[PDB]
């Protein structure tokens, strides 16, 4: 929730709530200096000193979630939430290991989707060929996989 | 996949004409409670209560609790039921009459439909412009943006308030980090690099993802099952928005405070214009008492008033006390250690004991329960047991007598194991025998008495 | 050092019979409890039952406290094992049944798997670029093995701990990449005769050889109180050290256990169930029983081994007596074992222990002489004398103690039965529930 | 580069650039350059 | 600036100043009117065993009770053994009535005090340059990076100590150090060797003139070396450790810039932490860095500790790095403060009570009333006549002990306004009805204190 | 020394049509008024007001916990 505000219809009260639920000397002293403040620092003739010296936020204690709480879902638990997912998955560390090139075929594009995800997790470069590919771009991934080996999967 | 005390029961096993009908689902015998239980079920399933009191009496081992997670599996999933005892409400914050309304607030339910608005693209260029900032202390301040994001149809070049500006100065995001911001709190979380910008000789442990398809402005709608007690912790100490309050106040210890009658009467008034407006459902519960008996006269005091509430939950009281004498003034002894004024709005459930062959049956659904298969003789050895010492302490007999089985080679439990984990494992009756006996006087081999 | 449990190296039964042995592993002298002990330390190693009480009952100086620490080195480091005393629940901070609460949760370990990156290899030049008062930080990192030849870009934290390492050209180091700790090895070449503040020649190793990116695989246990004080709070973490906890809702509970069965289905997570020992219970009021029966209800509850020592007592917080001071409606739901005071032919071979491990060497009549003084005062004074019969005859420089060494400790230190003695014969100059007088 | 200072440091030896646009500034008084 | 005053350097008479040690032989057998005692053999010899436990590092959670009456000499051998013991291992004498706390429960300034109570002694390096900076003088690079202005590739220190001066060759990454701290020709700055990040400490003394007004701290040269490579040893005790790891000191941000700026609480300390700290411990040990020395927490009035503390104690004592409890209780039967159930020895539960090596204590004789009260009148330098320390004596034998060492103030302060130099036995018999003892004024509150009227006494 | 915005002059209501202040008219008396004030206070309020800062500088109390 946000905190609850006081809905008194004079403009003296806008003035005090964005004076004190604000308050920017306290927002200037806890994010930092602005960009144009240190441009003139540091290009001056004698240094100088800054009203925030430094960023004063404390460093968050947790580095995938801080100062919020939106989450959202985790390529892991999408690895593993297929069985067949999570076999390939060994099978492609592997192959690559190997300095195989994989076809990998499919009879659903709306998986070719879905793996296409997976595959920008684990970093794996790859082309698409499906019946949504239109004919000259057809000629051309082709070629490329066959041109350019750092394509692993296709 | 842990066999706790309460596993095999699966619910109350009624017929559909609301007869109990014995051996069923778990429970062995016991109708006039389960039948009172089926009542207290389609009573909270038809939303006609504000308030009602159901004590369960009944001594100590005759499965008052049982009953509480038969009920707490009839209702179902989406029905809540807060579970809390006589010792949980005395705190060292607040006073036990918040707690008190705390879990009677935990025990309403509402299903919410909210249309969250994300702007979910990947930043392409982030340049602030800052304002006039006269001689005032604090120098300059930023106060306008120009962050264009570029979702997969169609890029998008918006402008911002100093406050969301915050919110992504703490989150630290550079160009070509994708984000999600969130025009409700005003939250932004950063998800990752985009992978226009992949490289595989990398040192931060970035999660790279594709650009988010579809429209950058999306629009989503979610279904959310939130109690009336989260709503008061939300308006109590505000943890949402891009001012200072909710910010330096999540930085803070959390500590539990006294949400007053006001917060309480007017997050009521917000709930029935959600209502009025077609989008959430109240569905109300239960507050279930274990251990009445060590809530003091200050408490009973203040269930009157919480129960006179045009929203209450039901409660459901458990006490396994005879004539005793009531926690808070020790000058008045009743029933139960309930008071004989809060006494009059419950409607008294009684439990009985049981009978030589239900402790059989209790004793045989246990064991296949566990896992532990047996022979008749050493059921009916457990069963006298049952009958001459207690009813839990004779379930208790069949976990070392089946690792005393697997010592011997055996894979059924023989009457020679439940004859040595008698004598290895003793009760409380024994135990007080051989302490009267042995410890005879004060000393070196004697007790502190 | 040598504490009063440092002889004990486990429970000392049999692993397929589990038959008490008369004398193995420390735990001389007592045949009934701990086979007893050893049937609860397999149905904990099973770790499928969950919501027991074990009662160890018995007089004091008997070895309880002697058994438990006999189940705890059984365990190992794997299951955890709170050595909770009963006292330590009266906070001031936080109410009395939460920290039962804690008290409970604090012994059900979670047991994750995770998968760490570690690089390996031998750094070739450093890149730093710095901002004037204030700024981002920008950094590349040119490392070589054997094998690869790689140039790694770097962000803020890497540099801020690259310059807390101090991280020349010509160090052997190991990033781990996902949590980011530096770990210098050693060196391959020679310090430089250039520069002043350098600093210690360390190890001299030579290129690793292999590959940069390397997986690792590792496994950390936390307890269940771990992960509800790191999601009860959204930036004071630390606390479940510092003991600031002040309250945990249960909302916050009530998700913690759902999320930690998801963790259990999907394999991501195991559940490994703990002993929770509480010494000493007696001192409990009726306020904590009344949580503890009901605590023992679910599938995320530790099984309670715990000791007493009081006959009929009254229990705390009530008026009325009962045996070992619990009262019988949780009398019904524990298993009492109780112990048996010793014989002097175990006292004998238990004070032999005991001199054999705080490196006492002794003559049979002292030893006789010991036994004798230890069949009227426990072991308790028994091994204070053996300790001090040590340290007397190092004073007078002799090589083994003897029986002038005990007859001197006995003379000088009492026991307390004559100082119960001494107290009853003056009872002018000791102050009673009165007044005392000076000759 | 604008206000960033570079530090390279290889197996022959270690140096610090500066750029030319800081000379000027108060930060090459260390540096040798000053106002 | 601060006057130094030259007058006499003494010292202020306590009640245990005379205490100088125990006062033994060669083999342990007590020897009487030796360093401060009179008497007191077999406790003075338990004690010496005592001390000889302690530092012989065999000790690992005894516990050692000192009974006998008031007045007869526990806390004597409580500051013996403290004195014995030396200044190097510690010594923690609290009290029963200083566990009761407001910010934590009592069972946890027990253990904080046992974590006082021990010692940990470190031997550890320090190389530093030191002094006070004369130039800072660039060098250019050999190959200047294109694109660039500058490039320097060692910067060079001149720094002069007290003693001599030397030039120094440094890493140009000193330069952020000399930015952010603004160093200058004529500050004193430390240069460490694991990091090389110099600080300025302050302009020196010699360029305390150039200026006017212009001041701030002048510190004068480091009159030391250049160059240190000095050892130091260096004692912390683990409730240091278990502070500084639970309450972090030092942070760069506001809520820990508020947390030392608002009160420090008392928190208390989970039992993992101690765990960790004792298993990192015995490892730094195990490696021959670090010395374990554990000292004496004696709790003076041991019963006042009530019921629910004992119980803590005997988890306290069987963990395996714990000091001596040496307890001091002075009761009979009495009732424990806690449970009001049993009357038991000493205040002492009579399960705490098989885990301590009770030492007696015994009244002491009339004839030795007079050697203590020579040696405590030689102490303060107040001498008398023979006459006067027998009638001392008989004031010390017919009333108390603590009485008769405290009729030797007024009367010496009686003697020298007389016109005397030592003190008689007029002064004495003077100064016996300037200061009345317990009794008699017992005497005079039940018999002229007779009942609650005008001129009486409220009961 | 102490000042408060009252409002915006009704001279200059309608320079825009919508904006948002508050239109008060010009007072119709003196500018300078003169007058004086006979008033008290407790020695507990110079106890309060010396101890902590109060009400004109406190923003940090807006947390309310500790
Ligand atoms: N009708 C029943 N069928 C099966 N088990 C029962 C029944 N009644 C009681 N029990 C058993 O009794 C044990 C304790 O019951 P519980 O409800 O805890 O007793 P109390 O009513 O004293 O709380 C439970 O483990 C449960 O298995
Ligand atoms: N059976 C035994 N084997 C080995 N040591 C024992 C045994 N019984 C007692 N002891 C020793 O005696 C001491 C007292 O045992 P403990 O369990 O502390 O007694 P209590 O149960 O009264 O606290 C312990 O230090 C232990 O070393
Ligand atoms: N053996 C002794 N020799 C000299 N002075 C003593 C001796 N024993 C006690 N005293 C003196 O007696 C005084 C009171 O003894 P005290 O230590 O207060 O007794 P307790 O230890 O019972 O409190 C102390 O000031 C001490 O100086």
């Known amino acids: ?154 | 996949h842990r066999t706790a005390a309460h596993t095999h029961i699966k619910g109350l096993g009624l017929n559909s004409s609301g007869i109990a009908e014995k051996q069923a689902a778990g429970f062995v015998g016991q109708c006039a409670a389960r039948e009172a239980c089926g009542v207290v079920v389609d009573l909270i399933k038809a939303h006609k209560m504000a308030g009602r009191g159901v004590l369960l009496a009944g001594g100590p081992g005759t499965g008052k609790t049982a009953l509480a997670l038969a009920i707490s599996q009839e209702l179902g999933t989406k029905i809540p039921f807060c579970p809390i005892t006589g010792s949980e409400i005395y705190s060292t914050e607040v006073k036990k009459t918040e707690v008190l309304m705390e879990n009677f607030r935990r025990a309403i339910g509402l299903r919410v439909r909210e249309t969250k608005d994300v702007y979910e693209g990947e930043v392409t260029e982030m340049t602030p412009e800052e304002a006039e900032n006269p001689l005032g202390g604090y120098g300059k301040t930023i106060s306008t943006l120009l962050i264009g994001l570029k979702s997969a149809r169609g890029q998008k070049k918006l402008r911002l308030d100093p406050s969301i500006y915050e919110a992504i100065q703490k989150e630290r995001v550079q160009v070509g980090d994708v984000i999600y911001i969130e025009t409700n709190t005003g939250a932004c979380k950063r998800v990752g690099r985009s992978d226009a910008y992949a490289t595989e000789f990398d040192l931060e442990a970035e999660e790279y993802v594709p650009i988010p398809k579809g429209e950058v402005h999306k629009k989503k709608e979610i279904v959310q099952d939130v109690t009336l007690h989260d709503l008061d912790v939300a308006n109590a100490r505000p943890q949402g928005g891009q001012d200072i309050i909710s910010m330096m106040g999540q930085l803070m210890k959390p500590k539990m405070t006294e949400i007053t009658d006001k917060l309480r009467m007017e997050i009521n008034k917000v709930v029935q214009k959600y209502i009025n407006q077609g989008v959430a459902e109240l569905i109300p519960g239960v507050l279930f008492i274990d251990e009445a008996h060590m809530l003091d006269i200050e408490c009973f005091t203040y269930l009157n008033k919480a129960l006179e509430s045009p929203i209450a939950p039901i409660v459901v009281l458990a006490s396994n006390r005879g004539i005793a004498t009531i926690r808070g003034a020790d000058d008045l002894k009743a029933a139960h250690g309930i008071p004989p004024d809060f006494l009059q709005r419950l409607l008294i459930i009684p439990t009985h004991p049981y009978e030589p062959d239900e402790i059989r049956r209790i004793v045989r659904i246990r064991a296949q329960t566990e896992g532990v298969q047996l022979t008749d003789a050493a059921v009916d050895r457990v069963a006298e047991h049952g009958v001459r010492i207690s009813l839990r302490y004779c379930l208790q007999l069949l976990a070392p007598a089946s690792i005393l089985a697997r010592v011997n080679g055996r894979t059924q439990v023989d009457v020679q194991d439940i004859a040595e984990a008698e004598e290895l494992f003793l009760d409380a009756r024994r135990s007080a025998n051989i302490l009267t006996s042995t410890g005879e006087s004060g000393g070196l081999h004697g007790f502190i008495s | ?439 | ?35």
């Open chain 3, 1 to 439: 050092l040598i504490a009063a449990h440092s002889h004990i190296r486990g429970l000392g039964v049999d692993a397929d019979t589990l038959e008490p042995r008369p004398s193995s592993q420390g735990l001389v002298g007592q045949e009934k409890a701990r086979k007893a002990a050893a049937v609860v330390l397999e149905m904990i190693k099973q770790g499928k039952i969950a919501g027991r009480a074990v009662l160890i009952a018995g007089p004091p100086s008997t070895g309880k406290t002697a058994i438990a620490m006999g189940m705890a080195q059984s365990l190992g480091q794997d299951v955890p094992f709170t050595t909770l005393a009963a006292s330590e629940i009266f906070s001031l901070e936080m109410s009395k049944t939460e920290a039962l609460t804690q008290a409970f949760r604090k012994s059900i370990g979670v047991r994750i798997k995770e998968e760490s990156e570690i690089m390996e290899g031998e750094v070739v030049e450093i890149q730093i670029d710095r901002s004037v008062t204030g700024g981002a930080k920008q950094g590349k990192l040119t490392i070589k093995t054997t094998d690869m030849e790689a140039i790694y870009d770097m962000g803020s934290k890497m540099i801020d701990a690259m310059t807390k390492e101090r991280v020349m050209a010509g160090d052997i180091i190991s990033i781990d990449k996902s949590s980011g700790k530096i770990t210098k090895l050693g060196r391959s070449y020679a310090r430089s005769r250039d520069y002043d503040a350098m600093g210690v020649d360390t190890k001299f190793l030579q290129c690793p050889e292999g590959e940069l990116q390397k997986r690792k695989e590792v496994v950390h246990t936390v307890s269940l109180h771990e992960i509800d004080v790191i999601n009860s709070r959204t930036q004071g973490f630390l606390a479940l050290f510092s003991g600031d906890t002040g309250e945990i809702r249960s909302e916050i509970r009530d998700q913690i256990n759902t999320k930690v069965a998801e963790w259990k289905e999907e394999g991501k997570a195991e559940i490994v169930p703990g002993v929770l020992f509480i010494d000493e219970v007696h001192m409990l009021d009726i306020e904590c029983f009344s949580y503890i029966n009901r605590a023992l209800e679910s599938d995320l509850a530790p099984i309670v081994i715990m000791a007493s020592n009081r006959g009929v007592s009254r229990i705390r917080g009530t008026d009325y007596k009962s045996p070992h001071g619990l009262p019988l409606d949780f009398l019904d739901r524990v298993v009492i074992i109780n112990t048996h005071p010793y014989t002097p032919d175990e006292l004998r071979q238990i004070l032999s222990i005991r001199a054999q491990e705080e490196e006492v060497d002794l003559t049979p009549d002292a030893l006789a002489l010991l036994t004798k003084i230890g069949q009227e005062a426990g072991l308790r004074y028994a091994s204070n004398l053996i300790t001090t019969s040590q340290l007397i005859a190092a004073k007078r420089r002799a090589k083994q103690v003897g029986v002038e060494d005990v007859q001197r400790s006995f003379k000088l230190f009492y026991d307390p039965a004559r100082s119960v003695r001494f107290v009853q014969e003056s009872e002018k100059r000791l102050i009673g529930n009165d007044g005392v007088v000076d000759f």
């Open chain 1, 1 to 154: 929730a946000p905190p609850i505000e006081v809905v008194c219809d004079s403009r003296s009260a806008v003035i005090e709530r964005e004076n004190i639920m604000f308050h920017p000397a306290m927002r200037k002293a806890l994010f930092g200096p602005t960009p144009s403040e240190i441009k003139e620092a540091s290009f001056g003739p004698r240094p100088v000193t800054l009203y925030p010296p430094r960023a004063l936020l404390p460093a968050p204690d947790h580095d995938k979630q801080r100062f919020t709480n939106i989450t959202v879902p985790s390529m892991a638990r999408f690895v593993t939430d297929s069985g067949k997912l999570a076999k390939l998955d060994e099978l492609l560390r592997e192959l690559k290991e190997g300095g195989h090139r994989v076809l990998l075929y499919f009879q659903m594009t709306r998986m070719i989707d879905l793996m296409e995800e997976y595959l920008t997790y684990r970093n794996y470069k790859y082309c698409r060929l499906d019946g949504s590919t239109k004919l000259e771009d057809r000629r051309d991934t082709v070629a490329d996989f066959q041109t350019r080996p750092e394509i692993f999967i296709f």
């Open chain 4, 1 to 35: 580069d604008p206000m960033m200072i570079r530090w390279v440091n290889n197996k022959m030896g270690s140096v610090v650039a500066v750029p030319e646009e800081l000379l000027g500034t108060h930060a090459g008084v260390v540096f040798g350059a000053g106002p």
